Design an enzyme around this catalytic site. Structure first.
Site, PDB file in Angstrom:
ATOM      1  N   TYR A  78      -3.839  -4.636   9.447  1.00 43.34           N
ATOM      2  CA  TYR A  78      -4.285  -3.364   8.914  1.00 43.34           C
ATOM      3  C   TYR A  78      -5.288  -3.341   7.763  1.00 43.34           C
ATOM      4  O   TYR A  78      -6.412  -2.864   7.933  1.00 43.34           O
ATOM      5  CB  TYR A  78      -3.059  -2.522   8.520  1.00 43.34           C
ATOM      6  CG  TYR A  78      -2.162  -2.202   9.688  1.00 43.34           C
ATOM      7  CD1 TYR A  78      -0.846  -2.634   9.714  1.00 43.34           C
ATOM      8  CD2 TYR A  78      -2.659  -1.522  10.807  1.00 43.34           C
ATOM      9  CE1 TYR A  78      -0.033  -2.409  10.834  1.00 43.34           C
ATOM     10  CE2 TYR A  78      -1.868  -1.291  11.930  1.00 43.34           C
ATOM     11  CZ  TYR A  78      -0.550  -1.739  11.939  1.00 43.34           C
ATOM     12  OH  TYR A  78       0.249  -1.512  13.047  1.00 43.34           O
ATOM     13  N   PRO A  91      -1.364   6.398  14.232  1.00 42.98           N
ATOM     14  CA  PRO A  91      -0.713   6.998  15.400  1.00 42.98           C
ATOM     15  C   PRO A  91      -0.118   8.352  15.057  1.00 42.98           C
ATOM     16  O   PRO A  91       0.152   8.636  13.894  1.00 42.98           O
ATOM     17  CB  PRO A  91       0.372   5.978  15.745  1.00 42.98           C
ATOM     18  CG  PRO A  91       0.804   5.530  14.384  1.00 42.98           C
ATOM     19  CD  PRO A  91      -0.528   5.323  13.665  1.00 42.98           C
TER      20      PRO A  91
END
Ligand code: NA
Length: 600
Positions: A78, A91
């Site tokens: 990330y 998401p």
């Protein structure tokens, strides 16, 4: 409660990792290239070679840390990613369509939701949330709970080359805790505590009403600063640094960086409110001319309560995974109907102080950055090819009666769907939880196995060439392979994290990048054209996300007893991908596979 007694993540034997690696890649790269990799791996793993030296350093690392991959995994997965968070990383979970006849129903829902969050946060702060347990054949075991305590106390700061996950410095004595409410792209501070008192559902309703009234006023609308959080991480780090030049922005950023979460009161949309339409809005708001600016992506949880009933949560993935997110959301939803009746409860108271609007100092530089971000977000909106595909022919009960694992069955199907369309398999990613271990997050299950290749070839390249007797057997070996890799992964014996650590240890100790990690074979193995995960829920909701590579697919599925929900994404800019075609191929594969089992 520091998990010091949970098992530490294991370090796999070197030769086994290298051997699995070669086996996984052979059928995915050209014969010529493979032969060179075999030599490269042999040199890497030879007695007294680079591999053994690094492995020794890794074991040292395992003794000194709680989890030897945490730092490496968090940055590689990330924090180092430069892509904009929207679609690429963050998401979203979509709730059932809500029925709001007027603004007041929307605000009551929001008020009820915030109240639920304060209750849930209360359970956490006092360590009253029950420990998750993993079912086992001979016994069960506790799972790591660290992810839950980062749900409301995390913020992702953008950096010029690397981002930072900030753990809210709750070292400050008791102060006014608050949530940030986004409306008409305006941000407001909503204090959830005044004196030794926690606002009641009624109070929150009253406070939200004032917010909607002040935000609706066009006379004092501020610039849509949230838009900047939607850009590339490096672009946002630059724009943010420009903002820090003024004391006013510095104060507003601090408030946002210390809130519990965001509540976004989105405006009405157009068109039918189908699962797909609602998903698009949670994923990117539809761009800056709709709800795209009524956001702040650096904050972990952003609850969306739209006027027309579109509700859900978009979240920043770096602090926790989907399983924990879903447990939190389900606990919240269920308590909103408790239961209641008674009376009332609530409370309311007075008379409470009005919620305060965050101010901004906008310069010519910032104005330039706003226009860039706006264009950039539109490209994402136009590029996303998304679809919520509901397979209703059957589900878990059928698969279970065949004595197969629903997850592995679906993964084999996805490999078939891909093969019948491209006539080859590609490096696939499937999230596998390693929470059995300290600070455990995930590792990868590589579903594009040699056994799966054999099965898909017999299923589409035969054309009546072979009996159902053989196909049925190839499927068995393929299912056995999935289950095996799955057990290997969840018990810390897979290869992805191991190779990741060796590579990073080499970067920190080798003057020159190793031949092993420059090898095209290795680079290809980490380009997941098929990125997937299972996010099961016990109610009306689903999770979705975008692809991780330009020519890839993102597939999130929710297995139900009589049905399976598939969320499929891809980029329009890649001519060789199409979300609708792939979905129909997945459907076809599930029907073909059922007919095969019926022929037994
Ligand atoms: Na495409």
């Amino acid at each position: 409660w520091e998990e010091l007694d949970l098992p530490k993540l294991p370090v796999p034997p070197l030769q086994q990792t290298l051997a699995t690696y070669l086996q996984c890649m052979q059928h995915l790269v050209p014969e010529e290239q493979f032969r060179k990799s075999q030599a490269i791996v042999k040199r890497f793993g030879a007695p007294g070679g680079l591999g053994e030296t690094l492995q020794e350093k890794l074991l040292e690392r395992q003794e000194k840390t709680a989890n030897w991959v945490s730092e490496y995994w968090l940055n590689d997965m990330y924090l180092n990613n430069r892509l904009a968070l929207p679609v690429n990383s963050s998401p979203a979970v979509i709730f059932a369509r809500q029925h709001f006849q007027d603004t007041n129903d929307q605000l009551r829902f929001a008020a009820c939701l915030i109240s639920g969050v304060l209750s849930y946060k209360t359970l956490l702060d006092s360590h009253s949330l029950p420990t998750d347990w993993a079912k086992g054949q001979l016994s069960g075991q506790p799972l790591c709970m660290k992810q839950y305590y980062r749900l409301f106390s995390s913020y992702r700061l953008p950096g010029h080359t690397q981002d930072t996950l900030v753990a809210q410095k709750s070292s400050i004595m008791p102060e006014p805790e608050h949530v940030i409410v986004a409306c008409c792209n305006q941000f407001f501070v909503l204090d959830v505590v005044i004196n030794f008192r926690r606002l009641s559902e009624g109070d929150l309703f009253t406070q939200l009403r004032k917010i909607v009234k002040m935000a609706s006023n066009e006379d004092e609308r501020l610039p849509p600063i949230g838009l900047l959080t939607s850009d590339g991480r490096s672009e946002w780090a630059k724009a943010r640094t420009v903002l820090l030049k003024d004391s006013t922005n510095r104060d507003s950023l601090d408030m946002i960086e210390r809130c519990i979460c965001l509540v976004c009161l989105d405006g009405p949309g157009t068109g039918e409110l189908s699962d797909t339409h609602r998903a698009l809005q949670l994923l990117h708001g539809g761009g800056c001319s709709l709800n795209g600016a009524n956001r702040w992506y650096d904050k972990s949880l952003q609850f969306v309560v739209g006027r027309d009933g579109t509700c859900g949560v978009v979240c920043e993935h770096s602090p926790f995974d989907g399983i924990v997110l879903v447990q939190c959301t389900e606990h919240l939803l269920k308590h909103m109907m408790t239961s209641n009746k008674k009376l009332v409860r609530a409370d309311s108271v007075s008379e409470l102080p009005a919620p305060r609007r965050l101010r901004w100092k906008c310069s010519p530089e910032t104005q330039g950055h706003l226009a860039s971000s706006a264009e950039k977000l539109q490209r994402i909106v136009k590029n996303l090819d998304f679809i919520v595909y509901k397979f209703d022919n059957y589900g878990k009960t059928f698969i279970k009666k065949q004595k197969y694992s629903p997850d592995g069955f679906i993964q084999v199907a996805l490999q078939l769907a891909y093969y019948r369309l491209y006539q080859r398999l590609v490096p696939t990613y499937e999230s596998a939880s390693i929470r059995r271990f300290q600070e455990g997050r995930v590792d990868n299950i590589r579903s594009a196995t040699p056994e799966a290749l054999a099965f898909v070839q017999a299923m589409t390249d035969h054309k009546a060439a072979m009996p159902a007797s053989e196909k049925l057997q190839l499927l068995q070996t393929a299912m056995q392979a999935q289950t095996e890799y799955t057990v290997m992964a969840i018990t810390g014996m897979a290869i992805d994290n191991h190779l990741l650590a060796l590579r990073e240890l080499a970067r920190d100790l080798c003057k020159e990048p190793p031949e092993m990690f420059m090898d095209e074979t290795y680079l290809m193995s980490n380009r997941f054209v098929l990125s997937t995960s299972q996010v099961p829920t016990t109610m009306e909701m689903f999770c979705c996300y975008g692809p991780v590579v330009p020519n890839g697919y993102g597939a999130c599925y929710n297995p139900q007893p009589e049905a399976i929900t598939f969320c499929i994404s891809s980029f329009h800019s890649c001519k060789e991908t199409s979300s609708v075609e792939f979905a129909e191929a997945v459907g076809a594969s599930l029907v073909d596979m059922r007919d095969l089992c019926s022929s037994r």
